[PDB]
Amino acid sequence: MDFTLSKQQQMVQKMYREFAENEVKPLAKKVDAEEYFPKETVEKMGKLGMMGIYFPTSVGGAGGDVLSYVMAVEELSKVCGTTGVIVSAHTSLCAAPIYENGTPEQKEKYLPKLCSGEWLGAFGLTEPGAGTDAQGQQTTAVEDGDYWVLNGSKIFITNAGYADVFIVIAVTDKVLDKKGRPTKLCSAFIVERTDPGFSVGKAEDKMGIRGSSTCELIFEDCRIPKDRMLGVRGKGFQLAMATLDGGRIGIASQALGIAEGALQETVAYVKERKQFGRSISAFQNTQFELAEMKARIEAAKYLVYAAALKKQEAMNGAKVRYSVEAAQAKLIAARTASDVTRRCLQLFGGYGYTRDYPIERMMRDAKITEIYEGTSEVQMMVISGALLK
Amino acid sequence: MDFTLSKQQQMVQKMYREFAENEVKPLAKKVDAEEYFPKETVEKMGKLGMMGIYFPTSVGGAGGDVLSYVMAVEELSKVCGTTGVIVSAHTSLCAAPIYENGTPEQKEKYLPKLCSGEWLGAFGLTEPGAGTDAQGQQTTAVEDGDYWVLNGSKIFITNAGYADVFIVIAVTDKVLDKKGRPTKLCSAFIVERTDPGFSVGKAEDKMGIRGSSTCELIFEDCRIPKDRMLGVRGKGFQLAMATLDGGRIGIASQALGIAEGALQETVAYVKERKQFGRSISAFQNTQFELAEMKARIEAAKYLVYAAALKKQEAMNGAKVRYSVEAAQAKLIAARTASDVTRRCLQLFGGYGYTRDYPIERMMRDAKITEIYEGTSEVQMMVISGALLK
Numbered sequence: 076m077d078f079t080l081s082k083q084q085q086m087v088q089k090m091y092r093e094f095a096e097n098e099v100k101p102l103a104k105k106v107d108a109e110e111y112f113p114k115e116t117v118e119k120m121g122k123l124g125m126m127g128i129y130f131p132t133s134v135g136g137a138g139g140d141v142l143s144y145v146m147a148v149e150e151l152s153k154v155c156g157t158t159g160v161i162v163s164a165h166t167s168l169c170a171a172p173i174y175e176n177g178t179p180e181q182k183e184k185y186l187p188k189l190c191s192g193e194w195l196g197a198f199g200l201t202e203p204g205a206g207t208d209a210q211g212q213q214t215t216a217v218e219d220g221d222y223w224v225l226n227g228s229k230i231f232i233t234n235a236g237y238a239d240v241f242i243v244i245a246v247t248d249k250v251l252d253k254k255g256r257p258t259k260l261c262s263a264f265i266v267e268r269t270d271p272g273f274s275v276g277k278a279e280d281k282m283g284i285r286g287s288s289t290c291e292l293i294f295e296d297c298r299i300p301k302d303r304m305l306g307v308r309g310k311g312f313q314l315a316m317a318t319l320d321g322g323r324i325g326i327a328s329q330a331l332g333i334a335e336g337a338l339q340e341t342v343a344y345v346k347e348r349k350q351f352g353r354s355i356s357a358f359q360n361t362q363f364e365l366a367e368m369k370a371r372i373e374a375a376k377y378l379v380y381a382a383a384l385k386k387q388e389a390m391n392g393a394k395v396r397y398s399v400e401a402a403q404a405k406l407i408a409a410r411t412a413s414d415v416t417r418r419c420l421q422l423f424g425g426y427g428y429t430r431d432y433p434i435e436r437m438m439r440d441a442k443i444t445e446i447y448e449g450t451s452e453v454q455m456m457v458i459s460g461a462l463l464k
Numbered sequence: 465m466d467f468t469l470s471k472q473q474q475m476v477q478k479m480y481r482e483f484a485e486n487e488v489k490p491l492a493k494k495v496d497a498e499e500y501f502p503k504e505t506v507e508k509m510g511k512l513g514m515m516g517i518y519f520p521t522s523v524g525g526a527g528g529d530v531l532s533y534v535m536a537v538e539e540l541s542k543v544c545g546t547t548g549v550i551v552s553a554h555t556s557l558c559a560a561p562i563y564e565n566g567t568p569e570q571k572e573k574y575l576p577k578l579c580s581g582e583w584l585g586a587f588g589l590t591e592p593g594a595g596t597d598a599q600g601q602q603t604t605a606v607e608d609g610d611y612w613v614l615n616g617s618k619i620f621i622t623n624a625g626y627a628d629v630f631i632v633i634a635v636t637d638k639v640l641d642k643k644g645r646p647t648k649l650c651s652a653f654i655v656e657r658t659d660p661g662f663s664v665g666k667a668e669d670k671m672g673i674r675g676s677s678t679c680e681l682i683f684e685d686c687r688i689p690k691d692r693m694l695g696v697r698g699k700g701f702q703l704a705m706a707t708l709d710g711g712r713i714g715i716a717s718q719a720l721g722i723a724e725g726a727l728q729e730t731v732a733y734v735k736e737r738k739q740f741g742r743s744i745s746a747f748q749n750t751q752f753e754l755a756e757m758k759a760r761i762e763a764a765k766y767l768v769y770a771a772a773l774k775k776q777e778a779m780n781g782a783k784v785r786y787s788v789e790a791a792q793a794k795l796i797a798a799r800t801a802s803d804v805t806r807r808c809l810q811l812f813g814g815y816g817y818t819r820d821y822p823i824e825r826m827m828r829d830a831k832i833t834e835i836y837e838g839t840s841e842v843q844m845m846v847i848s849g850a851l852l853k
Binding site: 204206230280282349351352417425427428438439443445447451 | 831
């Protein structure tokens with residue numbers, strides 16, 4: 076086995092890191108405190124080809140590998156969880172389901188505009204009564220002529236207030252199952268922000284990742300063309316779950332990035348600040364706290380990367396499943412973030428409780444990583460299901 | 465050996481419970497979201513005698529017990545950890561050392577207006593670079609005729625922006641130790657807000673308890689009368705640690721009340737919300753998390769209570785030390801609070817990540833209770849000190 080980076084992967088890593096510290100770090104505190112969507116850094120990332128990394132040049136992407144995309148989300152989230160999830164959402168939850176389930180007409184129209192950055196992407200699959208359910212979703216899609224009519228709502232939509240194209244999961248077929256119970260079949264749809272009967276709600280007031288534009292999607296007789304259906308009919312829910320599988324790797328790297336930047340800022344703090352006449356780093360407890368955290372972070376890092384490479388295999392035709400790898404990565408990375416950021420803030424003393432230092436923002440940003448794109452309990456469901464079979 | 469709340473302790477419980485549910489709950493959101501000091505709350509509590517509970521009637525108090533004070537903070541912190549911090553700071557950090565080491569003159573010049581709510585109390589010991597090393601501090605006081613003069617700064621001072629009387633620990637004498645090392649001896653000083661050359665800084669921006677006024681104290685030629693020295697000269701730091709012994713109990717009840725209010729809102733949330741065709745309280749995981757958390761919260765309550773009862777003994781003339789009980793309560797109650805609050809928010813899912821529910825405010829509030837008034841590391845030093853000796 077090889078656990079070393081390709082000399083190109085080391086080079087793209089150092090590119091993302093420098094862009095993060097030079098152009099995204101100096102904006103990190105304004106974005107969180109003012110709930111400010113970083114419209115400047117999203118056009119900057121687009122001109123760098125960072126909104127298309129792992130997608131090929133034949134569809135407008137940058138021609139990178141999945142692992143480069145993961146390093147980009149991790150390196151961005153070392154300084155800003157809002158910036159990091161914006162790339163992670165647009166990439167794995169809008170651009171990816173179109174690239175993997177799209178016709179050559181759908182790819183040609185949307186994908187070179189998603190990789191470029193003129194169009195931002197979003198996912199709607201969660202509903203209020205049943206985001207965490209497959210039957211409790213009610214947004215419907217009815218045939219009418221050569222168009223589709225959508226009615227319903229979606230909640231907790233990332234990039235909603237600033238996205239151009241949306242992947243929407245609606246119930247189309249009302250079918251009967253083997254056991255005789257009525258089961259609801261969903262289909263996936265490419266919904267544009269310019270569509271009639273479609274509206275994005277007011278940006279949500281969240282604890283962390285506050286710059287992230289989190290709004291509702293409202294469908295009131297939203298009439299869309301017939302070709303906007305992505306994939307097969309009635310298989311839109313399976314599409315939503317395979318899309319979430321890749322989207323869970325992006326959140327696992329975001330949490331890994333939040334925990335990694337927290338350890339940097341904490342290592343930098345304990346070295347300069349003095350207590351009891353010595354540097355904080357001179358006491359045995361500060362040394363054991365940091366050491367154990369660094370090991371847990373490095374263990375989490377290998378899980379994120381193993382999930383990224385397993386997806387890369389499935390992309391290259393090697394027929395393997397990576398839902399378990401993604402599931403383990405999000406479980407351990409998200410719990411590592413909330414665990415590390417709490418204990419790093421503990422080292423700053425009272426000075427970590429004020430906005431002077433960003434650890435209090437990392438601790439807030441890490442709590443969503445345990446929850447969104449599927450909670451850790453949903454990850455444990457996916458993991459144990461494959462284990463107990 | 466009785467673990468029941470008497471007959472009057474069983475009642476001030478519901479006095480402080482109903483009041484906190486009706487008067488104090490509607491306001492915790494504005495208090496925390498707009499950094500709003502709950503002045504109305506403080507006025508209602510002043511007229512209720514809640515600012516003087518365990519102080520006798522001979523000084524302006526309500527003739528209560530330390531436990532009923534401990535319960536007041538707990539029931540206030542179950543709804544608003546900001547309001548509980550205002551009472552506990554004033555009571556245990558300002559009114560407590562004035563009565564515990566003050567002269568009849570001092571006891572009659574300050575305590576009546578403190579126990580009646582007319583004056584808000586505060587306390588200053590922390591400095592920018594000697595917080596934990598509170599014994600190597602640099603604020604000094606020198607004699608001038610029949611006045612003292614004090615020059616320096618105090619940081620992280622709860623209630624400073626709205627307080628009327630402060631207690632200050634200044635370095636008065638530089639004397640020699642047993643083996644020739646020079647050392648710094650401190651003395652306690654009662655400082656009015658109206659004293660010349662004393663200014664209160666601007667309100668810091670903390671992660672939680674943002675409604676409290678934590679501020680910096682600036683002493684520029686602070687000319688105070690001679691009779692405002694508290695305690696015996698040169699023994700201020702012993703007095704500083706004796707005042708934090710009681711206050712550590714108060715922070716123990718605040719973290720406990722946060723954990724208790726978090727557990728309350730979680731049981732009420734899981735009993736109604738239905739995800740999988742039944743209430744989320746039907747998952748074996750929801751039952752196992754709330755049950756284990758409840759036992760942890762019960763056990764911490766017994767530490768918080770065992771600490772208040774030991775102070776009452778010491779205060780009732782028994783020669784007993786309660787610094788260890790106080791430490792074990794603040795260590796465990798604070799760690800419990802953060803662990804309960806992060807776990808209950810996970811049960812809320814994405815909804816607990818918004819400002820709709822108080823669980824995001826509870827987690828932000830819990831984090832401080834592990835830091836201020838002696839971090840858990842400082843608490844463990846105390847606990848280890850007595851044990852390993």
